[PDB]
Amino acid sequence: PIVQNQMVHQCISPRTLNAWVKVVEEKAFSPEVIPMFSALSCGATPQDLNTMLNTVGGHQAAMQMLKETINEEAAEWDRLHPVHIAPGQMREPRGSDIAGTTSTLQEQIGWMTHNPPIPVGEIYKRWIILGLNKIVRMYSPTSILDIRQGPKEPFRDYVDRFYKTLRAEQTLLVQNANPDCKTILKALGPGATLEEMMTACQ
Amino acid sequence: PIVQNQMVHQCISPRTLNAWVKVVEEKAFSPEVIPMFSALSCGATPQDLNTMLNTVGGHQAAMQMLKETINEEAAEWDRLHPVHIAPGQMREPRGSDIAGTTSTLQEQIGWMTHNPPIPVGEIYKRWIILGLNKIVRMYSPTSILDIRQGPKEPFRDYVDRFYKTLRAEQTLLVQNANPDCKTILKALGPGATLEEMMTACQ
Amino acid sequence: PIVQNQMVHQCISPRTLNAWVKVVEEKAFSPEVIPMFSALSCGATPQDLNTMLNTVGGHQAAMQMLKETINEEAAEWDRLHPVHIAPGQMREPRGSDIAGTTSTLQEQIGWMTHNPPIPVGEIYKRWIILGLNKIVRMYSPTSILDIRQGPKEPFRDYVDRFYKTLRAEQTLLVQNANPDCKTILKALGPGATLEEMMTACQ
Amino acid sequence: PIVQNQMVHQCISPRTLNAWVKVVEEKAFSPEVIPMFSALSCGATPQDLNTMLNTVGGHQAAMQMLKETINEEAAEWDRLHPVHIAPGQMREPRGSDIAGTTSTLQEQIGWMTHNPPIPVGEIYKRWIILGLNKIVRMYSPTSILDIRQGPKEPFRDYVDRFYKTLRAEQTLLVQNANPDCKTILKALGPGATLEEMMTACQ
Amino acid sequence: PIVQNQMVHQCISPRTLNAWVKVVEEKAFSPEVIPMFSALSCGATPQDLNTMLNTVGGHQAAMQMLKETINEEAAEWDRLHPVHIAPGQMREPRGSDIAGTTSTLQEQIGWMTHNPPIPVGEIYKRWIILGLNKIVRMYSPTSILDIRQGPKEPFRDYVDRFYKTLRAEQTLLVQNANPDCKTILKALGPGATLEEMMTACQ
Amino acid sequence: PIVQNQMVHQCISPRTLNAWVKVVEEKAFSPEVIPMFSALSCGATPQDLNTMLNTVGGHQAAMQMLKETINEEAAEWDRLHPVHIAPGQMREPRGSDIAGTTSTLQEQIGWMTHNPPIPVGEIYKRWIILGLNKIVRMYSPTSILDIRQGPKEPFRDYVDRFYKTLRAEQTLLVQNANPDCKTILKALGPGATLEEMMTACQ
Ligand SMILES: Nc1ncnc2c1ncn2[C@@H]1O[C@H](COP(=O)(O)OP(=O)(O)OP(=O)(O)O)[C@@H](O)[C@H]1O
C-alpha cells in the first residue's frame, strides 16, 4: 500500500495476505466479504489489488467474471480518457495501467503520490468492488419471495434470514410471516418500526 | 482510525477487523460485546465504524434495527444543526455525513482533525452504541423476575445469573433466593453488602 | 494507555483486550490472575481499566462486589480530597472521576500527564486490585487446615497444594504431612528450609 | 528485504518465513502459490529469496528443476553482461551473484541501493517465478480437454473446474458442457459473456 | 523492560507474558526453561521479573523455594552493601529493593538508567536464575547412574537420554551402554569424540 | 540481535524464540532446518545464538556434538589469533569469546558495532552451521543407493525421495529407476534435463 510515515510504499503484510485468503475460503461470496476486501485493501496500489485477487485459489469462474467487469470498466476509462513521452515525466494512465497489467509499481506509486494524486488504486478498487457485487448477486441462492416464516420459527430467526437474503440480492416482511405473527403485525397499523414488529411477535 | 504520530489517518488493522468479527460470532449481543466494540473502535472514523458493522455476516435483523436507530439520531442532528460552498473550505456535517453515507474519508479526516475538532467518529459511535444497547435489551432472553435460586444451586452461581440477567435487561435478590439462604439473608438485617450476603450463604 | 513516544495516549490494543478476556475465562479468580491484570493494564487510563472490567462476560456477582469496593474507596477519597471552574484550567478529581464514571478521557489524560502527574490510573488500579483480592479470597474453595498429605501422595504434590491454597487464602506444613514424612520432618530439627524438607521426603 | 525508514536492510521476519513454508505445505504448486511467493518476497535480496526456497522441506524434485531454470537464466545473463577490481568500488554482478551463490549480503545491498539501483533481487525473483511456472504446469494433473460437465453437476461448479485447470495449464467451455446446458448455450448466440452463460444455465 | 528508542521504560508485552506462562505450563522445570526465562526477561526491571514469576499459577512449592533463595541472596547483598535522604537524590538499593518488594518502578528505572547504571534488573535476574537451577536439580527425576542403554535401544536414543539427564542434574557413557555397543566402544580406544562413538554404534 | 534504527541492540523477540523451538520440535534435523536457523538468527549476537541453542529441550546428543564442533573451531581460532588491558579499550576476542562463554553482551556489542566490525555473531554462526550440517548428515536415515523407484511409484514421488535423501547426505537417478521408466530414460540420450526426464516418465 501507500501510507504515511510523506506518503511511502510499504510491502503488503503477510497478515493482510493471509486474512484475505482465509475470509474467501471461510465465507466465499457472502456479501460481508466485500467490505472486508475494501478494508484489507486500504492504501492498496493496483499491484496489491492484483496480489489479493491472484492469491485466491478456487472460485476461478468468479475470478474470470471479475476480469470481464474489469475490462469493461477499463474500456469505458479509455473512452473518457484517451492518451497520446517527455523525458523524466509522468504518462497518463490508461484502463490497463489502472488495472495493474501494463503499469509498473513505480508508475503506480508516481500516480498515487502526485500533487494532486491520480488515485489509481481507488479507481481500480471501485471496478473490483463493482465486479464483486455482481458475483455476490449471482451466488445468492434464494429469492426474497421464498423467505417465508415457518409455523414454529421464531420471528427473529425469520427476520435474520429475510435481511440476509435481501442483502445478497440487492409490506413483504409481514406478507411472508406466519399466520399468527402476520395477524399481530396487521393489527399494529402502518408505520411500525422493525423493533416494534419484532417486539410484538416475541 | 485517527491516531498520533500530529494527528494522522491509519488503515484499520486486520487484527481489529478480525477481533470484532470473532467477538460477534462467539458472543452475539451479550452485553459485554458493547464495551468491546467501543474499545476496538478507538480513534475510528465514521468509515471505520461502517466497516466494522458491514463486516458482520449474520444478525441482519439486528443490523437493520441499528440503521433505524442511526437514521433517527441523524434526523435529530439535522433538526439541531441545519447546513446552508466556499472554495477550499470545510462544509458543516449533516446527520448522514456523520453516519458516513454522504461524507468522504477526506471530509471525515478534515472534521476530526480541525482545531477545534468536529468529532464525527465519536458522535457516530454514540449513535451506534445506543442502537446496540436496544438490541442487547431485545435479545435478553429472561426477565429478572424468573431468575430464582434452585433448591441445591450454590448462592454464587445464582448471583452470577441474577446480575448477568440484570445487565442484559438494564430486596429482589433476597426474595428470589431459595428458602434456606432466604432465611439467612432476612436475619442479616438491612444494610448488608453483597460480599456479606454471599459469605453468609456459603 | 499513556506511554512514551513526551507522554501520549494510545488505543488499548486488541491483543491486550483479548489476553485479559481469555485469562479470566481460563483461570477465573485464581490468584495469579491479579498480577496478570496489573501487567496488562500498565499505563492504563481509568477508561482502559473500565474497558477491561466491562469486557468480562461472566462472573457478574464478582463484578458487582468489585463496584462496592470501588465505591467505598471512592468515598474515602472524597473524604480526604474535597473539590470546590477556572477557564482552560484543570479541575481536581473526585472519587468517581478517578473510577472513570464522571471524568472524560481528556480530563484523565490531563491529570495523568500534568507536571507533577495526578496519577488517576494508578490510583484506580489500586482500588480495583484491592477489590480483586477480596474476590480471590471469597472464591478460594479450601481452608489450609484441610490441605493434608495423602498416604501415597508425593510430598512435592502436597506442598504445591498447600502453597496454592495459602496464596488464595492470604509448623503447619509438617503437622498436615502424612505419618512417614511427618516423622522424617520432626527429626530434621528446627530451622529446616523448604528445600531441605522437600529433599528429606523425596 | 530492503525497505524505507533512506533504503535500509531489514531481517526477513519470522512471520514471512513461516507464511511461505505453510503455503507450500498446504497448497504445493497450485498456481495461486506464485503470486503469494511474489508478495511475501517484496523487497527481498537474493539472500532472502534463497532463504525462502531453502526452507521448503519437501518437493526436492521441484527445487532441483528450479536450480536448472536458475542456471539457464544465469548463463543467459553472463552472455549479455560479461564482467572484467577498483579499491572501494562496486563490481558488476554476474549470473551467480544475482542468484545469491557468489555475492555477499553487502554486495547485494550495494547493488540494490545504488543510484541508479542494480536491482538484483527483482532480477532473481523473475528467474525464480519463471522456474515456478514451469513447475505449476508440470504438476497440473489434467488436460482442459478432460474437464467436462457431469450430467447433474451445477454449471458453476463445472466452470470453476474449467478455469482452475486452465490456470494451472496456461468455444471449448460450451463444447465440454453437458447436453442440456450445451443446448441453452448454443441458443444464446455468439458474444455471450461468462456472466450471461452462467445465468442461462442456473 | 528498559530498552532503547536514550534508554526508556516500556510495558511488558502481552506476548512476553503469555510466552512465559505457556513455557512453564508445557515444560515445568525442564532445564531448557531457564534460558527461555532469561531471554524473555531481556531488559526486565525487577517489577517485570516479579510479574513473570507471580503470573505462574501452579508450582507454588517451587515458587516458595525461589523466595528462600531470593531472601538469602538479598541478605548477602545487605551484608556487602549497607545503606545509611538527600532531596531529589537517588538512594542506594538494598536487597529487597533489588528484588522489587520495597523499591518503586521509578526507583528501579532511576537505578537502571543512571550513568553508570546500578543494574538492579540484571542483579535480581541472577538471583532468580540461581533459584531456578536449584529447582531444576530438585525436580530432575533420575540419577545419571540409572541411564543405561536397553538391549534393542538405538545408541542415539540412549545418548539423548544420558545428556538430557546430565543437564537436569548438573567413561560413564560407555559403561552404561549395552554389551554390543560397549564392545565396539572399548575397541575405539581412548580419545574418541561423541560423533565417532555415535557413528560406530549406528 | 544488532539491527539499524546507527546500529543498536534489540532483545531477541518472543516470536523468534518460539519459531526456532517449534521448527526443531516439528522437523528435528531435516536439512531445511539449517537455513531456517540462519534466517531466524539474522543480526544475532553470540548471546542470542546461545539462547536459541539452549532453549532446545531434546536432542541433547546433537547439542553435545555441536559443542565439540564449537570447541574445535574455537581452538583453531586461537591458533590463528592469539591475544596478549588498556583502560576503556576493546580486547581482542578469543575462541570462547566468539562462542559467547567468556565474553559479555557489552563486549559482543562492542566488537560487532566497531568501525570496522569484528563480526563475532557471523563467525560463531558459521561454526554453529558447520556443526549443524554434521548432525544433519549423521541423522540422515538412508543411503542414496537405497533410494530405488517402486514398480508402481510415480516417477515424481521417486525423484522427491532421491533429492530429499541426497540433500540430507551431501547417471544414478536413471540406474535406480524402475525398468519401465529406466527404458524411457536410456532412450532420451545423454544431456536430458530433469524436467525432460520427468516429462518422459509421466
Ligand atoms: N482471535 C484470536 N484469538 C486468540 N489468539 C489470536 C487471535 N488472533 C490471533 N491470535 C494469535 O496471534 C497470532 C497471529 O498474530 P501474532 O500473534 O503473530 O501477532 P504479531 O503480528 O506478532 O503482532 P505485531 O505485528 O504487533 O508484532 C495467531 O497465531 C494466534 O496465536
3-state SS track over C14-65: HHHHHHHHHHHHHHCCCCCHHHHHHHHCCCCCHHHHHHHHHCCCCCHHHHHH
Q: Is the separation of the CB atoms in E5 and E107 below 8 Å?
A: no
| Closest listed residue to residue F107, CA positions, set F122, F125, F93 | F93
Domain range E1-143, CATH class:
mainly alpha
In angstroms, the CA A40 to CA A19 distance is 8
Nearest CA to ligand 1 atom 27: F15
In angstroms, the CA E13 to CA C42 distance is 9
Q: CB F3 to CB D14 under 8 A?
A: no
In angstroms, the CA E163 to CA F57 distance is 11
Instruction: State the residue for C-alpha cell 471524568.
Output: C103
Q: Is the CB of B22 under 6 A from ligand 1?
A: yes
Instruction: State the residue for C-alpha cell 564482467.
Output: D83
Instruction: State the residue for C-alpha cell 458453476.
Output: D156
| Closest listed residue to residue D1, CA positions, set D39, D47, D37 | D47
Q: CB F3 to CB D11 under 8 A?
A: yes
Fold match flag (A1-143 vs A144-202): no
CA F168 to chain CA centroid, nearest Å: 11
Resolution in A: 2.4
Nearest by CB to E160, which of F9, F15, F60?
Answer: F60
CA atoms within 13 A on the CB side of A125: 21
- Residue E132: φ, ψ to 5°: -70, -35
Q: Is the separation of the CB atoms in C94 and C147 below 8 Å?
A: no
In angstroms, the CA B202 to CA F21 distance is 47
Nearest ligand 1 atom to the CA of B22 is 1
Would you call C171 helix, strand, or coil by DSSP?
A: coil
Q: Is the separation of the CB atoms in A185 and A201 below 8 Å?
A: yes
Distances (CA, A) of C59 to A82, B27, B157: 66, 15, 9
Single-letter amino acid, residue C183: T
Sign of the CA dihedral with C108 first, then C112, C113, and C116 last: positive
Bond from prior residue into D116 cis (ω within 30 degrees of 0) = yes
Mark E91-122 as b/e (b = at least 16 C-beta within 10 Å). eebbbbbbbbeebeeebbbbbbeeeeebebbb
Residue of B nearest to C20 (CA): B36
**Which residues are CB-contacts of C66 (< 8 A; sequence separation ≥ 6)?**
C53, C128, C131, C132, C135
Q: Are strands D2-4 and D7-9 parallel, antiparallel or unpaired?
A: antiparallel
Nearest ligand 1 atom to the CA of D15 is 18
Q: Is the separation of the CB atoms in C186 and C151 below 8 Å?
A: no
Interface residues of E toward F, Cβ cutoff 8 Å, are 1, 3-4, 13, 15-16, 19, 27, 30-32, 34-36, 38-40, 42-43, 156, 159-160, 162-164, 166-167, 193-195, 198-199
Nearest ligand 1 atom to the CA of E15 is 17
Nearest CA to ligand 1 atom 17: E15
In angstroms, the CA B11 to CA A42 distance is 6
Q: Is the CB of C18 under 6 A from ligand 1?
A: yes
Residues present in chain F in total: 202
Chain E: closest CA distance from residue F178 (Å): 29
Q: Are strands A7-9 and A2-4 parallel, antiparallel or unpaired?
A: antiparallel
In angstroms, the CA F178 to CA F155 distance is 9
Would you call E86 helix, strand, or coil by DSSP?
A: coil
C-alpha cell at A90: 509522468
PDB experimental method: X-ray
Radius of gyration of chain D (CA): 23
Residue of D nearest to F2 (CA): D11
Distances (CA, A) of F40 to E71, E139, F17, F49: 38, 32, 9, 10
- Residue C88: φ, ψ to 5°: 65, 15
Select the residue from F55, F69, F132 to test the E interface by mutation, using most E Cβ atoms within 10 A: F55
Chain D: closest CA distance from residue F20 (Å): 9
Cβ-Cβ contacts under 8 Å, A4 against chain B = 8-10
**Which residues are CB-contacts of E94 (< 8 A; sequence separation ≥ 6)?**
E74, E77, E78, E81, E83, E102
| Closest listed residue to residue C32, CA positions, set E25, E11, E53 | E53
Nearest CA to ligand 1 atom 2: B19
Neighbours of B94 (CB within 10 A): 16
- Residue E120: φ, ψ to 5°: -70, -30
| Closest listed residue to residue E158, CA positions, set E168, E148, E167 | E148
Would you call F158 helix, strand, or coil by DSSP?
A: helix
Q: Is the separation of the CB atoms in C72 and C126 below 8 Å?
A: no
Distance A157 CA to ligand 1 centre (A): 33
C-alpha cell at B38: 467501543
Instruction: Please list every residue in chain B followed by a chain break, i.e. its C lies more than 2.5 Å from the next written N.
Output: 5, 84, 170
C-alpha cell at A81: 480518457
Residue of F nearest to D134 (CA): F195
Q: Is the separation of the CB atoms in D144 and D117 below 8 Å?
A: no
Sign of the CA dihedral with B182 first, then B183, B186, and B187 last: negative
Neighbours of A24 (CB within 10 A): 21
Cβ-Cβ contacts under 8 Å, C198 against chain E = 61, 65, 138
List the end-to-end C-alpha distance of chain F, in Å, as a whole number.
Answer: 48
**Which residues are CB-contacts of C40 (< 8 A; sequence separation ≥ 6)?**
C16, C19, C20, C23, C52, E14, E17
**H helix or E strand, kind and range, residue E95:** helix E95-98
Single-letter amino acid, residue D168: A
Q: Is the separation of the CB atoms in A10 and A3 below 8 Å?
A: yes
In angstroms, the CA B108 to CA B42 distance is 15
Nearest by CB to C39, which of E17, E57, E60?
Answer: E17
**Which residues are CB-contacts of A183 (< 8 A; sequence separation ≥ 6)?**
none
| Closest listed residue to residue E34, CA positions, set F105, F61, C32, F56 | F56
Catalogue the long-range contacts made by E48-53 (C-beta closer than 8 Å, 24 or more residues apart). Answer: E48/E1, E48/E12, E48/E121, E49/E100, E49/E121, E49/E124, E49/E125, E49/E128, E50/C35, E50/E99, E50/E100, E50/E101, E51/C35, E51/C38, E51/C39, E51/E12, E51/E17, E52/E12, E52/E16, E52/E17, E52/E20, E53/E128
Burial class (CB in 10 A: 0-12, 13-18, 19+), A105: middle
Transcribe E131-193 into DSSP letters. Answer: HHHHHHHHH----GGG----TTS-HHHHHHHHHHHHHHH--HHHHTS-HHHHHHHHHH-TT--
Largest interatomic CA distance in chain B: 76
**Which residues are CB-contacts of F108 (< 8 A; sequence separation ≥ 6)?**
F45, F46, F47, F100, F120, F121
Query: Of the residues B13, B15, B40, which should be mutated to test ligand 1's pocket, given the most ligand atoms within 8 Å of the CB?
Result: B15
C-alpha cell at B177: 433466593
**H helix or E strand, kind and range, residue C2:** strand C2-4
Please give the angle made by the CA atoms of B16, B21 and B26, to the nearest 5 degrees.
Answer: 125
**Which residues are CB-contacts of A42 (< 8 A; sequence separation ≥ 6)?**
A1, B11, B12
In angstroms, the CA F64 to CA F120 distance is 22
Q: Is the CB of F14 under 6 A from ligand 1?
A: no
**Which residues are CB-contacts of C98 (< 8 A; sequence separation ≥ 6)?**
C46, C74, C77, C120, C123, C124, C127
In angstroms, the CA E131 to CA E146 distance is 26
Nearest ligand 1 atom to the CA of B15 is 8
List the end-to-end C-alpha distance of chain A, in Å, as a whole number.
Answer: 48
| Closest listed residue to residue F85, CA positions, set F94, F73, F75 | F94
Q: Is the CB of C55 under 6 A from ligand 1?
A: no
Nearest by CB to B68, which of A38, A164, A194?
Answer: A194
Single-letter amino acid, residue E40: L
Q: Is the separation of the CB atoms in B121 and B46 below 8 Å?
A: yes
C-alpha cell at D162: 474449467
| Closest listed residue to residue E61, CA positions, set E140, E127, E138, E170 | E138
Nearest ligand 1 atom to the CA of B19 is 1
Residues present in chain C in total: 202
H helices of chain A, where?
14-27, 33-40, 46-54, 60-80, 95-98, 105-113, 120-139, 155-169, 172-175, 179-188, 194-200
Sign of the CA dihedral with E30 first, then E31, E36, and E41 last: positive
Compute the count of residue pairs across chains D and F with CB atoms less than 8 Å apart. Answer: 72
Largest interatomic CA distance in chain C: 76
Could you say which DSSP state residue C146 is in? G
**Residue ranges at the known binding site of C for ATP:** 15
Distance C14 CA to ligand 1 centre (A): 10
Residues present in chain D in total: 202
Distance C85 CA to ligand 1 centre (A): 46
Cβ-Cβ contacts under 8 Å, A193 against chain B = 65, 68
Q: Is the CB of F15 under 6 A from ligand 1?
A: yes
C-alpha cell at B62: 439486528
Nearest by CB to F36, which of D17, D63, D68?
Answer: D17
Cβ-Cβ contacts under 8 Å, F8 against chain E = 4
Chain B: closest CA distance from residue C193 (Å): 36
Q: Is the separation of the CB atoms in E57 and C30 below 8 Å?
A: yes
Could you say which DSSP state residue A81 is in? -
Q: Is the separation of the CB atoms in B185 and B192 below 8 Å?
A: yes
Select the residue from E2, E51, E64 to test the C interface by mutation, using most C Cβ atoms within 10 A: E64
**Which residues are CB-contacts of B19 (< 8 A; sequence separation ≥ 6)?**
B36, B40, C14, C17, C18
Nearest by CB to E61, which of C43, C156, C199?
Answer: C156
Neighbours of F192 (CB within 10 A): 15
Residue of B nearest to C47 (CA): B39
Cβ-Cβ contacts under 8 Å, B64 against chain A = 159, 163, 194
Q: CB D58 to CB F13 under 8 A?
A: no
Q: CB D17 to CB F4 under 8 A?
A: no
Distances (CA, A) of D62 to B31, B152, D122, F195: 54, 67, 21, 9
| Closest listed residue to residue A199, CA positions, set B131, B32, B140 | B140
| Closest listed residue to residue C45, CA positions, set C104, C4, C102, C5 | C104
Rounded-to-10 torsion of CA E158, E159, E164, E165: 70
In angstroms, the CA A91 to CA A77 distance is 15
Q: Is the CB of C104 under 6 A from ligand 1?
A: no
**H helix or E strand, kind and range, residue D136:** helix D120-139
Residue of D nearest to A140 (CA): D202
Q: Is the CB of B25 under 6 A from ligand 1?
A: no
- Residue E103: φ, ψ to 5°: -105, 145
Residue of F nearest to E37 (CA): F55
Would you call F3 helix, strand, or coil by DSSP?
A: strand
Compute the count of residue pairs across chains E and F with CB atoms less than 8 Å apart. Answer: 72
Query: Of the residues C15, C22, C26, which should be mutated to test ligand 1's pocket, given the most ligand atoms within 8 Å of the CB?
Result: C15
| Closest listed residue to residue E159, CA positions, set E172, E143, E142, E140 | E172
Instruction: State the residue for C-alpha cell 503455503.
Output: D23
In angstroms, the CA E146 to CA F47 distance is 34
Cβ-Cβ contacts under 8 Å, E119 against chain F = none
Could you say which DSSP state residue F153 is in? S
Distances (CA, A) of B126 to B39, D108, E58: 13, 54, 43
CATH match for C144-202 among 1.20.1370.20, 1.10.1200.30, 3.40.50.720, 3.90.1150.10 = 1.10.1200.30
For chain B, give every domain's residue range.
1-143, 144-202
In angstroms, the CA F65 to CA F73 distance is 13
Transcribe D81-135 into DSSP letters. Answer: ------TT-PPPP-HHHHTTSSS-HHHHHHHHHSSS---HHHHHHHHHHHHHHHH
Nearest by CB to C12, which of B34, B42, B164?
Answer: B42
In angstroms, the CA D127 to CA F79 distance is 44
Please give the angle made by the CA atoms of C149, C153 and C154, to the nearest 5 degrees.
Answer: 105
